[PDB]
Write a protein that binds this ligand. Structure first.
Ligand SMILES: CCCCCCCCO[C@@H]1O[C@H](CO)[C@@H](O)[C@H](O)[C@H]1O
Ligand SMILES: CCCCCCCCO[C@@H]1O[C@H](CO)[C@@H](O)[C@H](O)[C@H]1O
Length: 22
């Protein structure tokens, strides 16, 4: 479950980081 939680946070951060810079 920590692997899943960390991966979700990492992917959300990636998506938001890209969005901000589009
Ligand atoms: C790729 C990273 C390893 C993934 C391991 C998947 C097995 C998860 O491990 C399981 O976690 C569950 C907790 O809800 C429970 O079934 C057990 O406590 C644990 O064995
Ligand atoms: C934990 C959930 C994610 C919260 C952080 C997401 O925040 C992100 O941080 C970046 C810093 O690299 C900013 O540059 C992104 O534009 C911002 O959306």
């Amino acid at each position: 479950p920590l692997v899943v939680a960390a991966s979700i946070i990492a992917i959300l951060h990636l998506a938001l980081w890209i969005l901000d810079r589009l």
